[PDB]
Amino acid sequence: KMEELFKEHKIVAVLRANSVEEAISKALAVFAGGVHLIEITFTVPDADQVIKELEFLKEAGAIIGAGTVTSVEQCREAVESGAEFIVSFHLDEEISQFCKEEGVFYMPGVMTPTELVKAMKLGHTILKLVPGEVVGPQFVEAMKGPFPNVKFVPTGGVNLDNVCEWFEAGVLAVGVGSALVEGEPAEVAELAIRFVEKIRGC
Amino acid sequence: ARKMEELFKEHKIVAVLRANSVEEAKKKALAVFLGGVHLIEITFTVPDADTVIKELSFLKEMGAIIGAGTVTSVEQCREAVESGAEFIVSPHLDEEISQFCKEEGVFYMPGVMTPTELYKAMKLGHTILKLFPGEVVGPQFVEAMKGPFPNVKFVPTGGVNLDNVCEWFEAGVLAVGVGSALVEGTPVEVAEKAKAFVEKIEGC
Amino acid sequence: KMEELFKEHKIVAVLRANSREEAIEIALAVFAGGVHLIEITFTVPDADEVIKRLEMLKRAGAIIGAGTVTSVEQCREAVESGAEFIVSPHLDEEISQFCKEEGVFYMPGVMTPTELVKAMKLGHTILKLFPGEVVGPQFVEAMKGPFPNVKFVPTGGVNLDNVCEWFEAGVLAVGVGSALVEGKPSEVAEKARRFVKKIRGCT
Amino acid sequence: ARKMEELFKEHKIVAVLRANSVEEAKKKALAVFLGGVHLIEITFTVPDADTVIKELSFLKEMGAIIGAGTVTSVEQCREAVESGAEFIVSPHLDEEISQFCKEEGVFYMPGVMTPTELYKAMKLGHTILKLFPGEVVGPQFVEAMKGPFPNVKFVPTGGVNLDNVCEWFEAGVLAVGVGSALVEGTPVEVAEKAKAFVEKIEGC
C-alpha cells in the first residue's frame, strides 16, 4: 500500500554519505525528526550495506528503499538488501517487469508527456518527476488536466521556501535532499522538523 | 488534409473545451463560436464526449469546425471519427493513432515537447505539431527550432492569456490553443471573453 | 506538569557520554527508539551545550532535563541552558529552594526513611530512589504503609529482566542508564525499543 | 576519436555559423579563426555546406578544426564525411547516424534534452552530448545530471552570451557552442566579438 504511505507521509529523505557509518547517523537524525520514508542512493560506493545496516529502523517504522537505480543488476542487489521500493530517473521495462514479478514497488522517472503516457501503459500511476527545478510546479498543475489519474513525486527545486507550492500544484509527496539532508546529525534533525511542520500546515 | 493548414492560419485560435456535463459543453461551444472562434475541439476528458461532438451539426453548417481533443488511444480516436470529428488532437506522439487517422483521411495533430520527439513526428509526415505544455518550454523553443526544423509549424496549448498571445505570434506560431483563459464562467462572459481574444490577435 | 509526563512515559533515559558529540548522537538514538524523557548528567563535557542544542527536539515532543546536579550553581547554570527538570543523587536544600523560586521541577535522591521524611516535609512528593540496585523493589513496597503518598523513580539495577518487577512494586517510572544508552547509536535505538516495548506489556 | 575530448576541453568554445552563400560562410569562418576560435561548425542548413567544408581546408592546415552541424540524416552525414568533416553534430539522437559514424570512425555528438534521452544515448557509447536548447533547460540541468550520470560531458548550444558564458562553466560544462551571439555581421565585427568570448572564458 505504498500510495497509502506516500500520501500519508508526504515527504521522502534522499540520503548520500561519505561512508556507511555516516549514512547511519544521518538516517537516525532524519527518522528522529519525523521523516519515515528514506531513499538510499545506489550509485555510491558501498550502498548495499547501508540499506542492510538500516534494518533496525524497519521495526521502528522506517521504510527504506533504493534510489538512483540505473541497471537491473543494481535493482536485484537492492532487493535482497531488503529495499522496499526502487526509484529510477528513466522508464526501464526490464526493471519494471522484474519488480512486478518480485513484488517490489517501482517509481519510474519522467519529464515529458510522451514519457508519462508510455509509463502509464505499463501500469504506473505514480511517477517521479525529474529534474524538478526544470519543469517546476506549473508542469504538475497542467498535466493534471489530460491525466487526472497520475500523481507525481518531484525531486529538486524543492525547499522550505516553496515546498507548499508543490502541494498546491497537486503532488502526492516531495523528495528532498541536501536542503533536508546535510551537515551534522544535530542540524539534520532540526531541518527534518521544520519541513514536516510546513508540510503539515499546507 | 492540407485544408487544415489554411483553416488554422486564417482563424489563429483554437478553443479547448472541458466540461463535466453534456449540457454545459454544448452551451459553452455555442458561446465560443458566437464570440468569433471557429476552431473548437471537444476533449475526451468529459462524460459522453462523443455525444457532444455529434449534437453540433448546426454549428458545422455555420462554418464552424468541430474536432476531438485529449485522444489517448485508437479506440477513442475511432469513436471521435465516427462521431463527426474533423480533426484529432493528442498530448503525445502515437504511431497507432497516426496510422489509423492516415487510413481514414482524418487530420491528426500529435504533441511534442523535445527536439527528438519533434524529429520522429516529422518523420511520419506531421508538419503541424502541438507544443505542450507551452508554459514549460515558452516562445524561445519555437524560435530555436526554426534552424534545424524550418518547415515545422507549432500550435502551443498551455498558458496562453490575453497578455502572452502577442509574444507567441511574433515567434512564428501558426495558431494558439486556449483553455480556461477562454472558456470559463457563464455563457455570457465566455462569448465576450472570446471576442477579446479574437480582437487582440488581430492587432498582433 | 512534569508529574503527569513521568506517569505517561514510564521511563527516563539517563545519558552520560564521554564527549559533547556522543551525548547528542545518543540522545537522538534514544529519542528515535521511543524515549521522550532524557536527562543529561553534568559529568558530560560541555553538558550545557548539549542541553541547549537539543532544544530543537522539544518541538518534536522531547523533554530535556539535567542530572547529577550536586550544587546550586550547577542547578542555576542548567535552568539557563533550558533544563526542564533537575535531578540530584542526594537531598540539597539550596537546590530545593532555588528550584522552588524558579518554578523548576526538582527530584532529590533518597535511600532511607529518615531522608524520605525530611525531603517530603520540604514539599517533594516524588523522590529518586538511589542506588536502586541496593534497596530493591522491596523498599518501594514497604514504604507504602507509612508513606502512602510518596512515589519513586528508581535509578540503577533496572534491566529488561526485572523492569516489570519495579512496576509491580508500584514505581512511577524507571530511570535507565548504561543498559539503555551504552553502545553505538544503531544499538542504542534498538535497546530503547524493547525497553519501551516490555514496559507497555506489564504496566 | 578519444582525441576529440582533449580538443574540446582545451578550446572550450565552438563557433556555429550559418550563411546564405559560400562566400559569407568562408569569411565568417576566417573571422572567428583570427578571433581565437579553432573549433568551427558548418551547418547543413546552408545550401552549399559541403563546398564550404571542402574549401576551408586551408584553415585545417593552420590548426583549425572544421566539422558539420545540423545533420539530420544519414545521407547528409555521408556527404559531410566525404567533404572532410572531422565531427558530426545533430539536434537529436539518431541511431542510424550513430552506427554510420561508428563504422566510418567519425566523432558523433547527438543532442539530448531529457534524462531518458541521456540514458539511451550513452547506451550507444556516447559520453559527450550536445544540450539543446540550452536556453530551455538551463545550467540547472547540467548540475542535476552530474549525479546519476557522473561521466557525462555536455556542450550546450543556444542560450550562451557573454553574460552567462561564466555561469555555464561553473556547472562543469565541457565546452559551449555559440551561435549568432558570436557570428553576426561583417568579419571585423565578428573577429572582435569572437575574441571577447575567448578573453572572458580565460577569466572564469
Side-chain angles (χ1 to χ4, degrees), chain A residues 2-3 5-6 9-18 20 23-24 26-42 45 47 49-52 54 56-58 60-70 72 74-91 95-96 98-101 103-124 126-140 142-154 156-160 162-164 166-167 169-177 179-181 183 185-189 191-196 198-202, chain B residues 1 4-19 22 24-26 28-44 46-47 49 52-56 58-60 62-71 74 76-78 80-81 84-89 91-93 97-98 100-102 105-122 124-126 128-142 144-150 152 154-156 158-162 164-169 171-179 181-183 185 187 190-191 193-198 200-201 203-204, chain C residues 1-2 5-6 9-17 20 22-24 26-42 44-45 47 50-52 54 56-67 69-70 72-79 81-91 95-100 103 105-124 126-140 142-148 150-158 160 162-164 166-167 169-177 179-181 183-185 188-189 191-202, chain D residues 1 4 7-8 10-19 25-44 46-47 49 52-56 58-60 62-69 71 74 76-78 80-81 84-93 97-98 100-103 105-122 124-126 128-150 152-162 164-169 171-179 181-183 185 187-188 190-191 193-201 203-204:
Chain A
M2 294 300 293
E3 187 193 2
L5 291 162
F6 273 76
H9 291 303
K10 301 179 185 288
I11 184 164
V12 180
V14 181
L15 265 63
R16 181 179 180 274
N18 299 132
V20 173
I24 301 304
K26 287 178 171 175
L28 264 161
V30 171
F31 185 78
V35 178
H36 300 90
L37 299 176
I38 299 102
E39 181 183 306
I40 306 302
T41 299
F42 214 78
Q49 292 177 335
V50 170
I51 292 168
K52 182 158 64 176
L54 291 171
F56 75 92
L57 293 173
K58 292 178 188 175
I63 300 169
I64 299 102
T68 299
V69 154
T70 60
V72 173
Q74 289 178 310
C75 186
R76 289 178 186 277
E77 290 178 1
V79 171
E80 63 185 342
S81 290
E84 295 184 50
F85 62 89
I86 317 279
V87 184
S88 49
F89 282 40
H90 71 251
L91 182 68
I95 292 170
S96 179
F98 171 78
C99 289
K100 183 177 176 70
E101 293 175 7
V104 178
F105 178 70
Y106 180 57
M107 191 153 61
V110 299
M111 181 175 169
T112 68
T114 302
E115 293 166 348
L116 181 145
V117 171
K118 188 177 322 162
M120 304 189 325
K121 289 181 178 180
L122 272 69
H124 294 293
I126 300 170
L127 306 173
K128 226 261 181 323
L129 184 64
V130 295
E133 55 267 316
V134 174
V135 296
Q138 64 180 20
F139 173 89
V140 170
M143 296 297 103
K144 190 200 306 186
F147 306 105
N149 62 333
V150 178
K151 304 295 182 184
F152 296 98
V153 181
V158 55
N159 60 173
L160 289 171
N162 68 356
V163 46
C164 294
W166 282 103
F167 284 102
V171 302
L172 177 63
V174 296
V176 185
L180 175 65
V181 296
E187 295 175 346
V188 172
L191 287 165
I193 309 183
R194 265 182 278 169
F195 257 103
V196 185
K198 225 162 199 304
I199 293 169
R200 188 190 294 125
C202 298
Chain B
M4 286 293 175
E5 187 173 358
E6 282 87 58
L7 288 168
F8 276 63
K9 191 185 288 186
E10 182 177 4
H11 294 302
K12 301 186 181 182
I13 184 165
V14 180
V16 181
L17 269 69
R18 302 188 192 279
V22 172
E24 81 173 320
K26 287 171 65 179
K28 285 176 158 68
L30 202 135
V32 168
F33 171 75
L34 187 59
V37 177
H38 295 85
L39 300 175
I40 300 170
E41 69 179 68
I42 307 301
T43 65
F44 272 69
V46 311
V52 174
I53 313 183
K54 187 174 56 278
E55 293 177 350
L56 288 172
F58 64 91
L59 294 177
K60 183 176 179 180
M62 295 177 193
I65 301 97
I66 307 300
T70 318
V71 176
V74 173
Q76 290 176 341
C77 184
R78 187 185 301 275
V81 171
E86 295 186 53
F87 61 91
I88 304 295
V89 184
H92 65 282
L93 177 66
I97 293 167
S98 179
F100 175 78
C101 289
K102 182 176 179 179
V106 179
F107 180 71
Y108 176 58
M109 182 170 74
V112 299
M113 182 175 160
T114 64
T116 301
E117 292 164 346
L118 170 56
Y119 175 78
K120 313 178 206 148
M122 182 179 72
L124 297 173
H126 299 296
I128 300 170
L129 304 170
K130 178 180 178 183
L131 179 64
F132 177 79
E135 49 244 330
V136 181
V137 282
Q140 303 178 323
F141 179 89
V142 174
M145 312 281 143
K146 283 178 179 172
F149 305 98
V152 176
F154 290 100
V155 181
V160 175
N161 36 43
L162 266 163
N164 320 157
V165 46
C166 286
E167 196 173 345
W168 274 109
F169 272 104
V173 301
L174 182 63
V176 297
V178 187
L182 174 64
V183 182
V190 170
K193 190 164 182 170
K195 184 178 174 69
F197 272 91
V198 172
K200 190 140 187 182
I201 303 182
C204 58
Chain C
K1 189 174 183 180
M2 294 300 293
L5 291 169
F6 272 51
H9 294 296
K10 295 180 182 297
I11 185 165
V12 180
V14 181
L15 148 83
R16 25 235 318 177
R20 175 180 172 273
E22 287 179 355
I24 293 167
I26 294 166
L28 265 57
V30 170
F31 186 71
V35 188
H36 288 139
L37 308 156
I38 306 155
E39 69 183 65
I40 301 160
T41 61
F42 271 88
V44 176
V50 177
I51 310 177
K52 63 161 31 72
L54 296 173
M56 57 86 182
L57 293 176
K58 288 179 182 174
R59 205 153 30 95
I63 303 101
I64 304 297
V69 178
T70 300
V72 73
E73 62 185 342
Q74 285 175 336
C75 181
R76 184 178 294 111
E77 178 170 13
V79 190
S81 295
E84 295 186 54
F85 60 93
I86 302 296
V87 183
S88 64
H90 73 117
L91 180 67
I95 294 170
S96 179
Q97 185 61 34
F98 177 82
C99 288
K100 182 176 180 177
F105 183 79
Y106 175 57
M107 182 170 72
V110 300
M111 183 178 183
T112 64
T114 299
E115 291 165 323
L116 188 153
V117 171
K118 71 200 293 184
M120 84 183 181
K121 80 164 38 174
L122 185 60
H124 300 292
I126 299 169
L127 307 172
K128 172 177 163 169
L129 183 62
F130 177 81
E133 46 223 327
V134 176
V135 301
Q138 293 177 335
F139 183 89
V140 171
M143 293 300 104
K144 288 181 179 177
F147 308 113
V150 178
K151 293 163 273 283
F152 296 100
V153 183
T155 302
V158 180
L160 290 170
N162 66 357
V163 71
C164 292
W166 282 106
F167 283 105
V171 301
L172 178 63
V174 293
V176 181
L180 191 47
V181 307
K184 58 182 175 280
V188 172
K191 288 192 284 189
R193 283 273 293 161
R194 290 193 297 274
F195 266 103
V196 172
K197 192 200 306 186
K198 197 143 188 173
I199 295 167
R200 200 158 283 157
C202 33
Chain D
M4 212 69 213
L7 294 169
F8 270 72
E10 183 177 1
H11 293 305
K12 300 179 172 58
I13 185 165
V14 181
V16 181
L17 61 99
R18 303 175 182 263
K26 288 169 73 176
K27 289 182 181 179
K28 287 173 175 175
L30 183 60
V32 302
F33 180 72
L34 294 31
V37 180
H38 295 80
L39 295 166
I40 300 168
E41 180 182 305
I42 307 302
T43 60
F44 269 59
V46 175
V52 173
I53 292 168
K54 188 190 293 185
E55 292 185 13
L56 290 175
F58 75 91
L59 293 176
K60 191 197 303 292
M62 293 179 172
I65 299 163
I66 310 300
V71 177
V74 172
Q76 288 174 341
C77 184
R78 186 186 303 278
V81 172
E86 295 186 51
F87 60 93
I88 306 295
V89 183
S90 61
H92 56 268
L93 177 65
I97 294 169
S98 180
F100 176 82
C101 289
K102 182 165 74 170
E103 292 174 3
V106 178
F107 183 78
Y108 176 58
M109 183 169 76
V112 299
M113 178 174 162
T114 70
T116 298
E117 290 168 355
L118 171 56
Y119 173 73
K120 194 171 317 144
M122 69 180 73
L124 299 172
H126 298 296
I128 300 170
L129 304 168
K130 187 174 84 168
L131 184 65
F132 178 76
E135 61 226 285
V136 173
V137 299
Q140 294 76 24
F141 187 84
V142 172
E143 290 178 350
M145 294 295 102
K146 184 158 66 179
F149 306 108
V152 174
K153 297 166 195 285
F154 289 104
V155 182
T157 300
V160 190
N161 36 232
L162 268 155
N164 38 235
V165 68
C166 287
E167 178 179 353
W168 266 115
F169 279 110
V173 77
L174 176 62
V176 297
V178 185
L182 191 146
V183 181
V188 175
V190 172
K193 195 177 294 192
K195 191 184 198 313
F197 271 98
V198 173
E199 288 179 9
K200 202 143 193 177
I201 303 173
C204 18

